[PDB]
Amino acid sequence: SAVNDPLELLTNKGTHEPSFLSPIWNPIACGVAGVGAAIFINWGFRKPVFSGIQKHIA
Amino acid sequence: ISGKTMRGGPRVPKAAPYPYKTKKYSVFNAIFDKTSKRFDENSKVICVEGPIAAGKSKFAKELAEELDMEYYPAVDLDLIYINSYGYDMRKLDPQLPPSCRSYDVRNFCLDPSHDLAAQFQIRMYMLRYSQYIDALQHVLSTGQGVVLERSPYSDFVFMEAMFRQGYLSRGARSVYNELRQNTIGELLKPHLVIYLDLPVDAVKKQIKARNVDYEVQSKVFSDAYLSDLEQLYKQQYLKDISTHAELLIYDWTAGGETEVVVEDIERIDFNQFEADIHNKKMLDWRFPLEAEWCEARIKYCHEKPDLMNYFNVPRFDVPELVRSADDGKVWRDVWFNAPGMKYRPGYNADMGDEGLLTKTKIGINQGI
Numbered sequence: 021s022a023v024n025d026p027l028e029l030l031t032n033k034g035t036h037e038p039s040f041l042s043p044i045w046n047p048i049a050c051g052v053a054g055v056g057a058a059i060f061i062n063w064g065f066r067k068p069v070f071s072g073i074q075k076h077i078a
Numbered sequence: 079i080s081g082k083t084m085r086g087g088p089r090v091p092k093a094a095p096y097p098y099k100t101k102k103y104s105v106f107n108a109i110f111d112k113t114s115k116r117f118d119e120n121s122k123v124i125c126v127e128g129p130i131a132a133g134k135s136k137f138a139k140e141l142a143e144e145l146d147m148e149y150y151p152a153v154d155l156d157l158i159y160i161n162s163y164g165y166d167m168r169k170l171d172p173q174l175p176p177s178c179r180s181y182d183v184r185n186f187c188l189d190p191s192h193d194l195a196a197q198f199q200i201r202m203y204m205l206r207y208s209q210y211i212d213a214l215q216h217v218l219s220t221g222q223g224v225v226l227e228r229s230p231y232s233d234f235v236f237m238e239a240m241f242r243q244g245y246l247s248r249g250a251r252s253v254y255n256e257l258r259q260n261t262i263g264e265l266l267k268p269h270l271v272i273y274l275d276l277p278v279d280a281v282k283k284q285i286k287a288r289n290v291d292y293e294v295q296s297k298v299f300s301d302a303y304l305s306d307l308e309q310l311y312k313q314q315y316l317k318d319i320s321t322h323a324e325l326l327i328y329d330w331t332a333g334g335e336t337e338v339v340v341e342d343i344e345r346i347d348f349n350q351f352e353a354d355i356h357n358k359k360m361l362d363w364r365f366p367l368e369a370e371w372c373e374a375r376i377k378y379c380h381e382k383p384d385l386m387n388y389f390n391v392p393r394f395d396v397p398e399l400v401r402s403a404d405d406g407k408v409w410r411d412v413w414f415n416a417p418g419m420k421y422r423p424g425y426n427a428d429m430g431d432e433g434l435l436t437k438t439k440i441g442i443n444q445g446i
């Protein structure tokens with residue numbers, strides 16, 4: 021248009037396609053954090069980072 | 079405090095002992111389980127003293143045997159050098175000669191001229207002090223009496239003794255002397271103290287009967303050194319204990335008849351001492367309420383790490399007590415790369431541990 025319409029400019033007309041990454045990013049960020057935290061746990065405790073995967077899965 | 083012989087049998091624990099060896103103690107747990115319930119007559123600490131080579135280990139063993147306490151063997155400097163699979167870090171040769179190579183009582187006796195001796199001189203006090211907390215742990219959990227052959231309270235005797243000989247540094251004497259206060263304030267003094275008194279010559283007779291290639295042939299054993307024990311025990315060490323703990327002094331162990339010592343101790347009761355609380359004697363054991371019992375209990379069953387961390391004292395003003403960085407770096411490399419030290423105990427799977435990939439457990443005050 022040639023008309024700076026505030027409402028129509030704001031309206032959810034669409035054209036917003038999520039990436040394969042767009043929704044998945046948070047799951048593979050928080051889980052990556054928690055997995056790394058468990059590795060952090062064992063790293064300081066002088067325990068095998070691999071060991072006790074129950075902590076990592078949880 | 080009362081002998082089995084007068085019991086006509088064994089003593090019983092008044093209530094089920096708490097698994098303090100393998101279980102953590104919580105403030106929640108204190109609310110859920112009372113403390114002085116288990117406590118009984120024998121819930122007390124009988125410390126022993128004597129001039130060196132007094133053979134009191136067998137005495138204390140039998141004394142705890144026939145009065146039903148714990149023996150708690152004596153200082154074991156090697157435990158620094160021991161690990162989950164035993165072997166001696168003394169095995170590790172002088173790769174890092176200056177201040178990483180070991181120093182046991184053997185090395186001290188062979189030569190107290192080495193500044194590195196001061197290492198154990200303080201680490202030996204820590205070992206006593208750590209043992210003392212172990213004794214308090216066993217008391218407060220089980221309510222059973224304990225008997226420590228020697229105490230951190232008494233350790234300064236040898237300290238000032240070695241310094242008077244000149245072996246320790248003027249710097250080290252200050253370090254240890256001030257540093258005792260920091261931790262020694264945080265321990266309960268023993269109920270009863272028994273000190274054994276041979277002369278310097280007499281102990282030399284017996285130490286020559288010990289026939290120890292790292293002591294009997296050694297050179298430290300001057301009358302002055304082995305006598306400084308006598309003066310320090312006599313006045314410096316005894317008096318404060320004489321204020322708090324009840325003091326008995328027989329001649330010595332050899333003539334020390336266990337049964338009369340049994341009877342003399344038993345005759346000395348403490349219900350007599352259940353008078354005015356403000357009395358300074360037995361002072362460190364007047365616990366008003368079950369809650370205050372639990373405060374002491376949790377403070378030892380859940381704050382041993384806190385107890386150890388008091389030792390963290392910064393003093394880089396003493397050269398023999400400082401370590402070379404890069405050498406110390408390598409000393410770190412050796413210890414934690416050497417067999418059975420890579421991980422926490424039970425997780426040195428390189429040296430044999432199985433059950434890993436699921437095991438996530440750790441023991442109460444389990445070392446690290």
Ligand SMILES: Nc1nc2c(ncn2[C@H]2C[C@H](O)[C@@H](COP(=O)(O)OP(=O)(O)OP(=O)(O)O)O2)c(=O)[nH]1
Nearest residue numbers: 130131132133134135152183186199202233236293
């Ligand atoms: N530098 C130093 N050495 C000590 C200290 N306390 C004990 N030792 C040394 C001196 C002794 O040669 C050695 C222990 O020998 P002992 O005379 O205690 O043998 P004992 O017959 O008393 O039986 P036991 O030691 O209890 O198995 O450790 C200390 O506080 N500082």
